[PDB]
Amino acid sequence: GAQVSTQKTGAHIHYTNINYYKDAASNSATRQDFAQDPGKFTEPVKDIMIKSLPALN
């Protein structure tokens, strides 16, 4: 059961990976996980604030 994935390349090409162990802890790291969400740390406050309105009214 071979898996085909994209490679890390520049902008302005696939690598085959096969698991040979069943421990699942013997796999490679998940380097390609480019997801971010600053909503927790920034804009923590309950009532939402618009970009251009008086902050306190």
């Binding site: 890390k8 902008a11 302005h12 421990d23 802890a25 013997s26 796999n27 490679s28 790291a29 998940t30 380097r31 390609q32 996980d33 480019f34 971010q36 740390f41 920034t42 804009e43 923590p44 406050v45 604030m49 970009k51 251009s52 309105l53 008086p54 902050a55 306190l56």
Partner: protein, 268 residues
């Protein structure tokens, strides 16, 4: 992919993007275009090296110890702790809670030690590393039954080839590893206080399997840690201080920053 700036044109308006309140604690989020006229620019830049996994997926040497083929100190024992190396400790400290698989590489180098004995002949040394879980009997001497390792994971290495490598599953009683614990070992609160209370990862023992030659040989074993499949939560500020012990966070007091000659001056 990084967000790309939007082109803007001059306007006079009731709306006030630049004006905001620090007191709310909601960080202000304003683009360059709101403050000044800008031009449409596309960005191909990628936030692909800031990922927590990329930042913490590199081998670092947590600790090294020395043992002798002859003399009183036949074998070396090290308790398994992340804290004793500053670089590994500082990056782990960046998150309060971390969950991660561990990759271990051991590098062993043997140096001949000068001696009165002559015409020495040296067969290739073989080195045994054995890891004991809490409550496993400790070896008391190098020739002990403990060295059989029937119930204990163990690796045998012959000098002159690739360093031995193993993968470790996430081992914790807890759901996540705790970088900082604000707690006492007992209910009374009289006793040791610190992260050392949650410290029970076991101990590692290294010995010469065999002695090639009469002359004394000293072997250094270096242990390397590489986080894998990393998961983090509750981020913490940068430590900003030199470390003092691996059992506590006690610190000599430190100035906030290096000092420039004057508020106006651009020179550090």
């Amino acid at each position: 992919r990084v967000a790309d700036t939007v082109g803007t044109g001059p306007t006079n308006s009731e709306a006030i993007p630049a004006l905001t309140a620090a007191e709310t604690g909601h960080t202000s989020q304003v683009v360059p275009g709101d403050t000044m006229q800008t031009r449409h620019v596309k960005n191909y830049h990628s936030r692909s090296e800031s990922t927590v996994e990329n930042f913490l997926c590199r081998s670092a040497c947590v600790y090294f110890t020395e043992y002798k083929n002859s003399g009183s100190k036949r074998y070396a024992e090290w308790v398994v702790t992340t804290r004793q190396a500053a670089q590994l400790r500082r990056k782990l400290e960046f998150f309060t809670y971390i969950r991660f698989d561990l990759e271990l590489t051991f590098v062993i180098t043997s140096t001949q030690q000068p001696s009165t004995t002559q015409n020495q002949d040296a067969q290739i040394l073989t080195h045994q590393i054995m890891y004991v879980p809490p409550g496993g009997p400790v070896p008391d001497k190098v020739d002990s039954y403990v060295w059989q390792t029937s119930t204990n994971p163990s690796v045998f290495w012959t000098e002159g080839n690739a360093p031995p490598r193993m993968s470790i599953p996430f081992l914790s009683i807890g759901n996540a590893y705790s970088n900082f614990y604000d707690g006492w070992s007992d209910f009374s609160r009289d006793g040791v206080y610190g992260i050392n209370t949650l410290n029970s990862m076991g101990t590692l023992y290294a010995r010469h399997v065999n002695t090639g030659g009469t002359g004394p040989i000293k072997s250094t074993i270096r242990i390397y840690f590489k986080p894998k499949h990393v998961k983090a939560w509750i981020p913490r500020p940068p430590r900003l201080c030199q470390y003092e012990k691996a059992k506590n966070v006690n610190f000599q007091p430190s100035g906030v920053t290096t000092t420039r000659q004057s508020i106006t001056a651009m020179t550090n």
